[PDB]
Write a protein that binds this ligand. Structure first.
Ligand SMILES: CC(=O)N[C@@H]1[C@@H](O)[C@H](O[C@@H]2O[C@H](CO)[C@H](O)[C@H](O[C@]3(C(=O)O)C[C@H](O)[C@@H](NC(C)=O)[C@H]([C@H](O)[C@H](O)CO)O3)[C@H]2O)[C@@H](CO)O[C@H]1O
Ligand SMILES: CC(=O)N[C@@H]1[C@@H](O)[C@H](O[C@@H]2O[C@H](CO)[C@H](O)[C@H](O[C@]3(C(=O)O)C[C@H](O)[C@@H](NC(C)=O)[C@H]([C@H](O)[C@H](O)CO)O3)[C@H]2O)[C@@H](CO)O[C@H]1O
Ligand SMILES: CC(=O)N[C@@H]1[C@@H](O)[C@H](O[C@@H]2O[C@H](CO)[C@H](O)[C@H](O[C@]3(C(=O)O)C[C@H](O)[C@@H](NC(C)=O)[C@H]([C@H](O)[C@H](O)CO)O3)[C@H]2O)[C@@H](CO)O[C@H]1O
Ligand SMILES: *[C@@H]1O[C@H](CO)[C@@H](O)[C@H](O)[C@H]1NC(C)=O
Ligand SMILES: *[C@@H]1O[C@H](CO)[C@@H](O)[C@H](O)[C@H]1NC(C)=O
Ligand SMILES: *[C@@H]1O[C@H](CO)[C@@H](O)[C@H](O)[C@H]1NC(C)=O
Lengths: 316, 170, 170, 316, 170, 316
């Protein structure tokens, strides 16, 4: 006698939001904001380098921590908190800029600049850089006066990059802990280290003076860098306090650097990384880490945003 | 919803309708039955899936580090970076909030209209043989056995066959 | 609007309807009256308020100074800051423009449908006793005193009582 | 005989915009973009510090303008245009960075570094810093040669922060207006002021030479700063042109700095601030000041955007 | 679409309707004709144009260079600039993608409803003289010459004139 | 007997996208993302300056490339790749900042600072700056010792801006290729160039040393700049290695600088520019160049986004 038209319903629908109403119940909804972690670096498919004890900038100068990686090749570069760019205390000028370049470098291929030093000591070392007792950076040369207080003969060096990609040159200025040891290592009188090329144009003067005892030393080493163009030619004029380089660095290809505190995993595949692991999701948004890198869901403040996949629920 | 079906004339939904999203419920001589309409159920499902495919979106845009977690960058450049990211997080938090609330509003209204459509379609089939009960049902003014009900459900019901009789029961 | 009610069959609105948003206007033996429907009026109001509560939004996000008004910052970092802010102002100016135009479009269509719904509901009540005038009114083919009108307005009108008579006035 | 269905309408509806049409009339609309000001700083609920004559950076070095605030405590820090970080002419290196730190510092608690100076003058002063006639910065010591032209004995000072939060250290380099007065104050021969710690690593040389007469003086004072870590130790090596500090600064808690030219008001409650007062609104957007700070409505270009709260208006 | 007209009861569209967007097609004694409805065609066109005018938008906001193409800026400030621009390109790429998909969804539904409206309007005119075929046509239960069809199309059709006769053909 | 309601349709509709479906066919659609170029700089209505061989920063110092533009006036400034800010090798300190100022300057009006030099040579020149043989920058003076090795008398110069807009002052530090030629030009002993005013406060020391042979020279010229306020007064103290200015620059009005490699066109009107020409469009979005400048459509990743202007197409 009668026929009816109807729609399904449930006893326990889920609440979602609309333009018009808050918490209106629907049949079925799905999550749109991701919160699910993976406490490892999903590295499957990518050639990964875990720097560990080694600081990223240290792969260019080569302290003992980084002997492992003096010429690394990577798709995925991982920095660790215990990493140090240094054995003998010192900073890098424009450190974070250089850090950002190396993260995408793909790795570094080194090449000898071929400097020859006459009339001076060349084999400077320190108890801070330990291999078999005292040593120094593996890529640098601690140019020293031939003996104590002996004058440092004003020298000039040169190096022309002949490759198709530009060359990362890195040198250092040694600041002594006193005027006493400064002359003891480079002779008396003022010192100057000027550096020239096409692009670059600057100069440097050491600053002897007492400091805190960082790693047993009072002195510091100011590491500076520049990018040398194809066909261009660096020029190092100096007469002391100069930490000469032996090798210039070249960028291999393309990579992506992250900073994490969780173990690697060559079994899971990943694309979005952060300090706490990998975010593998199909959802458009995430609420895990705003500083996530790679190809990631968009970071949003909300913990949850539910997209209805069913109709308005009207129970029986 | 904007179409008065769900939470409207159909006073409620059927928890017994597990076959599909929409369906028929008839009462005749042989008793009472309840069967779902595949065509309309699939129509609504296909449109919800269509929302899903487009919203499960992957950007090929890669973003790298401009911050540093282990050695804090210079204060001024760090504050600009922190300010920029914060202003953009605010934008995507807004976009996400609006996107979902908008799609949810559309999803409800959509399923609401698919029901109404179906109700209108059955109404066009019976023509003069039935009348609206006001609760989403049609009172058939002839006798409708289970095969008659089926003919309505599977869209093969002929109204001329029962026209004379149904109109007679004025 | 998308539902053909407002600015459609109902040729216009009633400036005399101060009681509520929607209402009835009848003409019978005892004369003519006009009374508003609370239920539908509240339905529309509740949905407009629902828009209000969600759009009167407060962010707990605090932004501080990266500029300086009294001592201008360095030119390059200042131009990046000015460029970033300008690009974001453009985004929120767009979002605000779109948000309002979209909600306004929805608000109009929403109230438009609430009227139509009500018109459909009265239509389901009278069943066979009346017919559409085409202007949003029903011509009742029986006699409808003020208590009869009230029974329609307060949803208690029984159509069987007048069915035989109303159908007789074919 | 007939019953009708209808909706209300007015004679004077308000125009709004939609996706489809411009200026379509509705019954009632509300404003969505705020333009209403409050010409005061609504400070109720917050502990406010109005620096006035005092410049924010001056609270660390302490010129006479800032004797008032050498150890301020604030939730809300207000800078004024007439503020000056200086009595004796000079700038701050990385000024705006330090300004940004102090705005959220919550205030500053000072602590003596305890330096002792033998064989030299210590009580340098100037007509620029006026208290009872000539004076100097309240937090700094103008180390001077014991008499005119007398050599400045090469000294070294040290200070270890032992608190759980890091310590803001501030020193200054005095640049004289001539080589004549430079030696007159620090003796002849070159001067150097090097500064060392863990993080920091740099050096400084004075630059005697004539300049404009700013505040009666030809000379300048280069104010530099650094952040000293817990357990770390600053070290000041010098032999002239050094403006030593007496006290190190420590950040109290959390605050928020603004720049305004309107009076305070501890009677009204506020959260969004700008130069012209306070923005107290529920509306999602504002069109007052793009550089507004605190918890504020989003800045938009438009002067007005009307959200319809009624139906389409069809008059009678 | 959300209104069941286009791709619904009207099984398809008419490639022969070049006169306008919507139209009538009748079959009577003198034969068969097809003529478009200007009023509804213009209504839909005006709303699509309204979308066009608002979306062909010009910002008076001028942006200048913060980059350099011939002499690359400093690496850190360049990476922040590149990061900021990339994050904003992502925002406008999203906004544009959503805007179009949303307007397209609205445009389809809009034209869908304008057709349905028109169908409802003709239905209100004929009242008791015709019945729904279920395919978007009305079966007239009297005789409708070309002038009769025209009277329906140009909204001047009087139903009382044919009421007695049309009802007689029950 | 029957009348039907219907809508138009076509055999070949165009595919667009919706919230619910991908590639649903409609009657007519229009493009929303612009890809159409114009391979020229549409300059009609604007006074345009094509710098060509001249580098933008060179208009202030005036190498031979820029004699053309020592006092240019522009609404639209165009930089070219072959542009050089230099004849004698050297950089500009804070170059891009100064570049950004000049792009909107509207042009530059120069004014003499009026320095007079006694006891020294003034007419220094070089084979690098060629006009009629060796010459120098048209706005600078290469102050030279009166003869070879003769001491450079410690001098001081001054200049007060008296105009209502601030004055761009530019000087240079000459770094010699050796200590031999340094004394040969400015006498023996160290050199210092300090610069003072109200805002500014710094100093400079030359850095003699060998470099690459850029443009025939081993030496370089460090160009520095500052902004001199109304009523303020620059002061130049020096005794060698100083490239004094003759004229200070003043900004005319307002302009907009671009970088392009396509010819100008005073026949077409334009507003959005990029390296490859002009984008003249009504569409809200573009997919040509993300770094486009002026009043431009918003840059989006997508190549095409179609906005439906017709109904859903259901063929016959
Ligand atoms: C207690 C205090 O403040 N005294 C410091 C003192 O720390 C510092 O002495 C240094 O002590 C460390 C071990 O703690 C080393 O023995 C340093 O010796 C070496 C070094 O290994 O670095 C020896 C090495 O042969 C030297 N290499 C060369 C090439 O000369 C280096 C080098 O000369 C200096 O490190 C360069 O600064 O020193 C030893 O110096 C002294 C340093 O002068 O300062 C006291 O104030
Ligand atoms: C007209 C001109 O160019 N002459 C300047 C001249 O301005 C300047 O002289 C200074 O004049 C002011 C008052 O206008 C003071 O009298 C300066 O004296 C003091 C000072 O108060 O600053 C005296 C004070 O006792 C000194 N304090 C110490 C610790 O020495 C200071 C201090 O020596 C210097 O200010 C440090 O630069 O000076 C007075 O110098 C002179 C300055 O040399 O330069 C002319 O060219
Ligand atoms: C092969 C090599 O490394 N030798 C360099 C050598 O290049 C350089 O010599 C310079 O050569 C160029 C032409 O190639 C000029 O002749 C330079 O002479 C001038 C100049 O024109 O610049 C002459 C001019 O009269 C001088 N002007 C003044 C005011 O003195 C200038 C000026 O002194 C210097 O350019 C300033 O640095 O020089 C000529 O110098 C020499 C430069 O010392 O260095 C060799 O190592
Ligand atoms: C930037 O934000 C992070 C937290 O998001 C914070 O740890 C860091 O200190 C901030 N950097 C600066 C310079 O304020
Ligand atoms: C940034 O913009 C403000 C106006 O919004 C202006 O006063 C200021 O000068 C600009 N800063 C720079 C460096 O252009
Ligand atoms: C910024 O991006 C452009 C391409 O969009 C690239 O050419 C340039 O090298 C980038 N700059 C830096 C510093 O990475």
């Amino acid at each position: 006698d009668k026929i009816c038209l109807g729609h399904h319903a449930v006893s326990n629908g889920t609440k979602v939001n609309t333009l018009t109403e808050r918490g209106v119940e629907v049949v079925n909804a799905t999550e749109t904001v991701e919160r699910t972690n993976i406490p490892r670096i999903c590295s499957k498919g990518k050639r990964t380098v875990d720097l560990g004890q080694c600081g990223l900038l240290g792969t260019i100068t080569g302290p003992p921590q980084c002997d492992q990686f003096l010429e690394f090749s990577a798709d995925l570069i991982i920095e660790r908190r215990e990493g140090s760019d240094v054995c003998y205390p010192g900073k890098f000028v424009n450190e974070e800029a250089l850090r950002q370049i190396l993260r995408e470098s793909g790795g570094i291929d080194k090449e000898a600049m071929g400097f020859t030093y006459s009339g001076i000591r060349t084999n400077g070392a320190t108890s801070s850089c330990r291999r078999s007792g005292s040593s120094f950076y593996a890529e640098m040369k601690w140019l020293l006066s031939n003996t104590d207080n002996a004058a440092f003969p004003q020298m000039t060096k040169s190096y022309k990059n002949t490759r198709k990609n530009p060359a990362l040159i890195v040198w250092g200025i040694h600041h002594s802990g006193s005027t006493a040891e400064q002359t003891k290592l480079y002779g008396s009188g003022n010192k100057l280290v000027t550096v020239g090329s096409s692009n670059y144009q600057q100069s440097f003067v050491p600053s002897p003076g007492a400091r805190t005892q960082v790693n047993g030393q009072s002195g510091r080493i100011d590491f500076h860098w520049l990018m040398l163009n194809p066909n261009d030619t660096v020029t190092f004029s100096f007469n002391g306090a100069f930490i000469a380089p032996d090798r210039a660095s070249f960028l291999r290809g393309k990579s992506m650097g992250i900073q994490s505190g969780v173990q690697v995993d060559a079994d899971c595949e990943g694309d979005c990384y952060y300090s706490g692991g990998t975010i593998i999701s199909n959802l458009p948004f995430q609420n895990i880490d705003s500083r996530a890198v790679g190809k990631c869901p968009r970071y949003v403040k909300q913990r949850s945003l539910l997209l209805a996949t069913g109709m308005k629920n009207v129970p029986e | 919803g904007l179409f008065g079906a769900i939470a409207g004339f159909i006073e409620n939904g059927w928890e017994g309708l597990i076959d599909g999203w929409y369906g028929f419920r008839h009462q005749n001589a042989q008793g009472e039955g309840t069967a779902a309409d595949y065509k309309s159920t699939q129509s609504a499902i296909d449109q919800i899936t269509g929302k899903l495919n487009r919203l499960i979106e992957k950007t090929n845009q890669q973003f790298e580090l401009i911050d540093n977690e282990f050695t804090e960058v210079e204060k001024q450049i760090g504050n600009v970076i922190n300010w920029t990211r914060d202003s953009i997080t605010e934008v995507w938090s807004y976009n996400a909030e609006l996107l979902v609330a908008m799609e949810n509003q559309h999803t409800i209204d959509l399923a609401d209209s698919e029901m109404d459509k179906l109700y209108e379609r059955v109404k066009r089939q019976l023509r003069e043989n039935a009348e609206e009960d006001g609760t989403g049902c049609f009172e058939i003014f002839h006798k409708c056995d289970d095969d008659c009900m089926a003919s309505i459900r599977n869209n093969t019901y002929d109204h001329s066959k029962y026209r004379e009789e149904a109109m007679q029961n004025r």
